[PDB]
Design a protein around this ligand. Structure first.
Ligand SMILES: [Cl-]
Ligand SMILES: [Cl-]
Ligand SMILES: [Zn+2]
Ligand SMILES: [Zn+2]
Lengths: 334, 334
């Protein structure tokens, strides 16, 4: 069973509790730190978008369509569907001769409340461009068009692009990705459950190049640097991913996934991080990733304090009164 | 530990898991069914609104202000902030010569996405009337004004109304309510943590009159019947509380609370129910309350099937593809 990783307090009592697992692995596969079950297969969901963006870069598509750090960050992004994000996704599809009609991810309203209010006020309905995965899907469509592969059905298990993605993520993680570990993701593409140990190892390899072909090392490093250089484009206004990567500019990589996943890397320390809140709560995964990062910056007061501000947070009610805290437990400092 | 009460699946695997506690008690305090820890103090939050509506009824205020089942349901309600709910809260305050400016609960946008889209398109900003607790607070203000008590500060621990509420909830539940069990609620009023056993017992007494003074029995029955007669006003469009009380009209009482609480009653069976998802997820608490109710309707095939449809539900992605299920575990049928 997984330890209690996060507590939610009200008055003088714990009101709710989150259990979870955490794997921290270096480029060589060495375990630096672990909580709970890092050996049972868990769906990474959107947390592994940077891995799925390798076809876009490695194929030459990114360079052929003139993509910079903003486009690669958006390809790696679970974004808010702000105008900047929608404009860039449309720009990406346009350079490959496509538009919104080529996306197969569907439409949804922003999962940032303030952006949803803006969307609702200016649209009858969101489009597939507003989908948090529209950057990744435009990356997929660009990767296909550059290689004269028909993008139609790019979301399906048997499409050449999804065949390629299974191979790429097996090479990074050492985990086998197949039908028995496969589910359908939010955006209708395959998501493959794998141990947290493997997922963390894979990010440690993307961060360091350890055990990768040089082109894959270079593409991997380029995607990780793009996310850290353009953190707004990975998520957006009011988002943990964006704010966490603004604490130590260029030094911390993070990516949220649906159902309480986080992947992260500290390239200068050669470490990859993956974690799962067992109940699937985003708030627990946010506290956990900040507290896990904090272990590696205990000699930098300002960075440690900033990270602990996410590990342990005041909650305010509708009048803005402090009612309690979300707080990572003492297992992250043991 | 608390047992695994709910699983969330994707493909052929459990993606996330919820642990929880459940107390089912009769009018006399006899335990009919239990899971996990029913003896540790948990915040009922909004789940005990019917208890907090007793001053409104017992004072004479409800009768003096001509409140029927719709107003009492709204006094007991965590509503969506739909125009019907807002209009009724404004009508309730108006009977005492009051309006939105007398509410101290604060404003918030709907936590129902469809209502939020409607709110965003029709309002610059929500008001305190849009607050899910605006009915309860209008009841509180009416209770004060009928007895010539100043409603100003009615949310404060030391206000005569909150003194009264501590007395009422102690007598129903047999739990001691004071500062050590006290936190601030979403709506800035006190919320008191108590064991689930006590909370369930309290609803069993409201449902049966067992061990209550006649006026309290009658006020208790009237609140429970109003919620069951006007279930839209307890919650609203697309809400578990509303839909669960439409399965067997007049026979099932349910009330959700923030952080994965549910209280319920089946008056004709003399049972009170309280439960807690340990992690605080609403989706887990909804599955749990449906599966717990289902145990008591195993000889009514139509009612059992309708309840099981809430205990075990398909989840669909943005394209409407079935990706997995939320399902109460087999501990609810053991
Ligand atoms: Cl989904
Ligand atoms: Cl009594
Ligand atoms: Zn996706
Ligand atoms: Zn309230």
């Amino acid at each position: 069973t997984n330890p209690v990783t996060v507590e939610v307090t009200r008055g003088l009592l714990v009101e709710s509790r989150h259990r979870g697992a955490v794997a921290v692995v270096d480029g060589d596969g060495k375990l630096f730190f672990s909580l709970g079950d890092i050996d049972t297969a868990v769906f990474p969901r959107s947390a592994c978008k940077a891995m799925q963006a390798l076809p876009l870069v490695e194929s030459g598509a990114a360079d052929a369509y003139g993509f910079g750090d903003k486009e690669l960050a958006l390809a790696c992004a679970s974004h808010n569907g702000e105008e900047e994000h929608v404009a860039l996704a449309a720009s990406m599809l346009s350079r490959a001769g496509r538009n919104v009609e080529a996306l197969e991810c569907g439409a949804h309203w922003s999962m940032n409340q303030k952006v949803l209010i803006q969307q609702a006020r200016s649209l009858d309905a969101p489009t597939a461009l507003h989908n948090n995965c529209s950057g990744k899907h435009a990356g997929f469509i660009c990767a296909c068009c550059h290689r004269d592969i028909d993008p139609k059905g790019y979301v399906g298990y048997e499409h050449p692009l999804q065949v390629e993605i299974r191979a790429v993520m097996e090479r990074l993680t050492g985990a086998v990705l197949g039908a028995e570990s496969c589910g359908t993701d939010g955006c209708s593409i395959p998501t493959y459950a794998m141990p947290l140990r493997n997922l963390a190892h894979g990010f440690a390899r993307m961060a360091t190049g350890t055990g990768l072909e040089p082109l894959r090392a270079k593409a991997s490093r380029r995607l990780i640097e793009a996310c850290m250089a353009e953190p707004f484009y990975v998520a957006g206004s009011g988002r943990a991913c964006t704010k966490l990567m603004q604490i130590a500019p260029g030094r911390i990589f993070v990516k949220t996934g649906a159902e309480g996943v986080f992947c992260a890397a500290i390239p200068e320390k050669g470490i990859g991080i993956s974690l799962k809140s067992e109940d699937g709560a985003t708030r627990a995964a946010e506290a956990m990733v900040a507290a896990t990062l904090a272990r590696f910056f205990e000699t930098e007061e300002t960075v440690h304090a900033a990270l602990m501000a996410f590990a342990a947070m005041p909650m305010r009610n509708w009048n803005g009164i402090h009612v309690g805290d979300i707080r990572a437990t003492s297992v992250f400092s043991a």
